[PDB]
Structures are given as C-alpha cells and as structure tokens.
Symmetry: C3
Subunit: 238 residues, 3 copies
Amino acid sequence: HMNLRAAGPGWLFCPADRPERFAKAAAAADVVILDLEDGVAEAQKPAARNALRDTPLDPERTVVRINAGGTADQARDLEALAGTAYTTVMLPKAESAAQVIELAPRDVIALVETARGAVCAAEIAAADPTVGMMWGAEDLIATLGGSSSRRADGAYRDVARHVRSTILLAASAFGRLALDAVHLDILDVEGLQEEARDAAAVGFDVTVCIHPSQIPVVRKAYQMVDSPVLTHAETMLR
Amino acid sequence: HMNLRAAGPGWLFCPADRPERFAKAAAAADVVILDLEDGVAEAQKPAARNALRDTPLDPERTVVRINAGGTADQARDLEALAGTAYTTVMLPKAESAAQVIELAPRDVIALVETARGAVCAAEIAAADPTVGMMWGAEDLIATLGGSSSRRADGAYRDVARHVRSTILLAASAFGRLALDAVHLDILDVEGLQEEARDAAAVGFDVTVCIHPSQIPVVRKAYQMVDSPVLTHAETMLR
Amino acid sequence: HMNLRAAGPGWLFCPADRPERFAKAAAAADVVILDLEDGVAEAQKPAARNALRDTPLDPERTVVRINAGGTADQARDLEALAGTAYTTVMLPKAESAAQVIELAPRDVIALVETARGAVCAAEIAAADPTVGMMWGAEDLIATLGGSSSRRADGAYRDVARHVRSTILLAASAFGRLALDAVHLDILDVEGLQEEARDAAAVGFDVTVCIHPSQIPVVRKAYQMVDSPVLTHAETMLR
Ligand SMILES: [Mg+2]
Ligand SMILES: [Mg+2]
Ligand SMILES: [Mg+2]
C-alpha cells in the first residue's frame, strides 16, 4: 500500500498526543511513525486517537504504531484508525504470525522486542500482512528480566546483537523491510553514527529515530574481487 | 514443584559421590545440583547413587543432574531417584523435546551443550516438563569437534555466545528459568564477575558455579526514557 | 561417496575455465573445488564445462561448485557432470531442502550465503543428500542489500558472525562437514591465520581458500577440568 522503499531511511517516532508537532516531524523525517503505544501515557491515549483523526499526515509517508496484540488499547486504536487514510501499522511486542494476521487487511511492520517474538521471527516475517520487521532492544531486555541493553562502552549486549541479526535475516528472507532499533541516547551522535553505518553496511533499510536531530545523522550514514563484491560497490554508488 | 525463582541466583554443582560435602554445599549456595554425570567418575556413579539416597538435602533447594538420554547410567539414576524426595532433574546433552518428555512427571532443567540441542532449543524449552534451560560451553565445543570455548582474553568464542543467547531467548519465550554456564577458571574471579554481571544485565536468572567461592561473586553480580527503561530501573531496585 | 573427513582442512577454489591450473591446484590443496559459478565469467561457463569433462582430477579429492537452483546454468552444469566421475557438488545460494534434494543422487555441500538460506539452515543440513554446510559472507551481505561484510579492523560484522555460527551448528547437528568462509583479502595472512585458528578452535572441519598461498596457513591453523575439557586436549593431540 505504501512505497516504503522509495522513502529515505530516516524514520521518526512522533507521539500522537502531540498534534502540534506532526507537521514538524513530517518535514524532518522520511517517514513518520505516529505513536499510540509507549510514546503516549496511558491517560493520554484517548486524546492521541482523536489527534490521529483530526490532524492528518501524508499516508504515503506515515505509519501508525498501535498497541500490543490482545490489549483493549489495540481495539480502541483500530477503531480510531477506521476514520483515517492510513494503511500501515506497526505492531509492538509482535509475537506470532496470528497477531500479524489479525491486523489484515492492513500492512504490518512487526516490532519484535520480546523473546517469544525473536523465537518466532521467521513465522512473523512470513505472515501475509507483514511488510517490515523492526526490533527493540529496551523492551527485549525489560521482558527478559534484565537491566540494560548496552555495555559501558555503549555497544549492544550479546542477546541484543543476536535479535538484531535474527530480525534482519527474517525480514530479508521474506522480502520485508528491515528496520534497525532506536538509539535512545539522543545526544550520543557518535554512537548513532557508528550504529547506523553498521546497520546500512549489512543491509538494514531504515534506522528508526526518536528525535529529529537524529535524522540527518541516519541519512548521511546510509584481495580477490568476485561477483558479490562488485554488488557491494554498486550498492555504494546507489 | 520447586519455587526456583524464590531461591537466589547462586547454584552450585556438588558431585554426588562426596556426601561429606553435601551440607557444606547447601550452606554455601542458593540451590545445590547434586551431580550424577560429569562431576562423578564412571566407576564412582554407583556409590554416588547410594549417597543420593543416604544423605538427603532440602528438596526445595536441590536439583539432581542425571546422565544423558538413552544411557544405561540414566536408567540407573532414575531408579536411585525413586527412593528420594527430589522432584527436579537436570538433563545434560539435552537434544529433543522427547528426551525431556521421557522424564515426566519430573520437572526438568534442560542443559543444552551440543549442536543438536542448540538447533532444537525452542522445542526443548516448550516441552511440558521443562522448568529451566541451561547451556554448557565446554561440552558444546567438545561435541562440535573444537578445542576451546574461549579466546586468549577469556571472552567466549562466537558459537558459544550464539548458543548462550539462543538458550536465554528459548527459556524466556516459554517462561522457563534461564541458567548461565559455569566459569571453569575458578581463581578467575575478575572474569566471573564480568560474566555474571553480563548475565544478570540481560535477564539470566541464575549463574551456575562449580566451586563455592564463586557463590558470593554471583550473588553480588545479580537520553530518552520510555516505558521499558523504567522497567530496567525497577529491576535494579529489585 | 567421498571420505572428505579423511582429507585435510585446506580446500581451494579453482575456476573450471582454467584447466591449465587444475594439476597445480590439486597438488597445493587437500580438496579442490572446481568452480562453474562465480569464479567463471558468464561467457566462459560453456568452456568451463568442457574443461570439466576434458581435464579430470581425482574424484576422491575434488568437488564441483555448480550454479544456483532454478538457473539454466545449473541445468547445463548437471549435463556436463554426467560425463565425469565426480559425485559431490557444492550448491551456491542454497535456500531450501528441496534445492538440495533435487540434486540427488549426488552428495551436496550446501553453501548458505543468503538470508533465506540462513533461516532454513537446519532444514538444508538435514536433507538426505547433504554432506556439508558452508557459508559465504560476501553474497550474504550483497543479497541483504548491504555494502561490506567486515568492519575496518577486518572483523566480521555481526550478521556474518551470526550466520557463521548458524551454519556450524546446523552442520554439526546433522553430522555434516562444516566449512568456513573464504578470506578474500589474499595478502592478509595475519587475518587468515586468526580466522582459521578461530574456526578450528570451535570445530569447523575446513577453511575454504581462493588462493593456493592460503593453504599452508590453514593447514597450520588446524581451573576445573571436567570430561569435555579432556576431549579438548585430545582433539589438540589429534
Ligand atoms: Mg518498545
Ligand atoms: Mg557438560
Ligand atoms: Mg558466493
């Protein structure tokens, strides 16, 4: 429904209870994720659903993050979405093909951020509504029962690196977009640069951002020679 | 059958042919693993089975490591266990759901330490008797045909890191306890500290030890802010 | 059909359109991979098929890399192979058990170098014709849409490390040979030494080479003590 590959790699969360920021987010980013989940406080989600209806963005360049499968919030989200022109939703805590299928006929970006989602990543990616896979390090660690996703130097811990590769491979195996996880340390531009360069080098399509200042960094970040090495060179020229 | 989550994170192997050490092991550790497998020489396993019957420990805080599926030793182990109050066994070289199921009605901690076990980790974790997943680096490398699990600096080699993450994710996907592998270099307290801190940070529930001096180390070892980051902070306070 | 484990660990690609080099490749390496795929230009593949028939090597120590499943080149390759004594083929871009099975009654070394192949590695390894698993970092990154498989220091990027471990585990779970990926930087002998030492330490059986100068490097590259640690020591003595 959307030509997401035609849009650039800089995607930006915007909490949907801040409609006064929607235009700025759309001007700053390649794709805006209007957020009904963790970016919006529980008490503000009804107001976010009204803003979703009242302040429209370009549906060719906007995705809506709904709430998790089986929640009453998700039911309210889908009702609010009915009166919009949006076609593509982002499903947080995505944990099964069935959770993706129950969102048909919408296009779905599955955000894997739990152990069950990682174990089921291939089944989630293969589901007919899926158009992209994302991963989320902080909810992954939280639901695992841990306390940090990164070492002292800022490098991802191993289980986070493992899920990152899992999602990239599952997405690419089924022709889906691959979206890399957000860099929560906004002022850590050095770390974001290295992370987005790393993501682009292995074939992520998108780095998702939580602050508009990260979008320029992402956009900029994105012997024997045999056939694949020449493809690497062509990908660079492109 | 056991409230294993209620016990602390410091689990300690004690070879079952050393009953004179059982009381000391129970006083030193949160949970004792009385070992009928690799901790006991082949010729001493019959004596270990008698000690298992004769010198009981608290079954709320003691697990018995039996021998691998299909071995005559495992058959002897289960016969010896019949006359004990233990309910929970640790299955080494765990390689299929069927190996776990044939131990019903016992509770099972599956110790994955072979390639087949890693490939089948999700099926093993989902098996109805499973209450925990552990991994073992040295038997993993041995059965792969290799010669060391760690680099010169003591860091795990990549296939070991891969299986570690595999077991953590499979355990957590099915609500099982996650047990991190033993640190064979007993006097390497620095390495154990970093390893157990790493394990606790990503949500392992337990670090298993092979010497009681490791238990204190383990017990001690265990921007944009969104919902999961606050859960990280709560997990720390707890 | 071949006692591949009896041969040493140094395998060497030789483009099949260079029959004047076949004898030198056989003398330099433990096993020669006569290449009909990426080592030979599209326009030279018919000449490579004739050289395959005309200049035979020892079939106990020679494997033929054919072209990918579903290609017209692969059909031509199998026709050319009919008039040879070779029994074992290497399948590039191996992506399903069905691709391996359609090569029966030949023995197959599946070369996984795409996301779909990584996701399906266990099914590929378990296929009845499979005798080995290899992985390929450059085609993996190319087909993912990325631009490099290695960081600036030459270390593999994470998705490459992930697929490497995936292939080692899948191969070993089903009793197959495990072949480590080629080191394209031929003059980087230091990096190859560390890489092949790493591969041998975790139980790869083979490091595949693209230049004969790499074969000597590969051949040379290949506390509590419990049962598996003694197996590590025995593997070293052997
Ligand atoms: Mg999240
Ligand atoms: Mg073991
Ligand atoms: Mg290739």
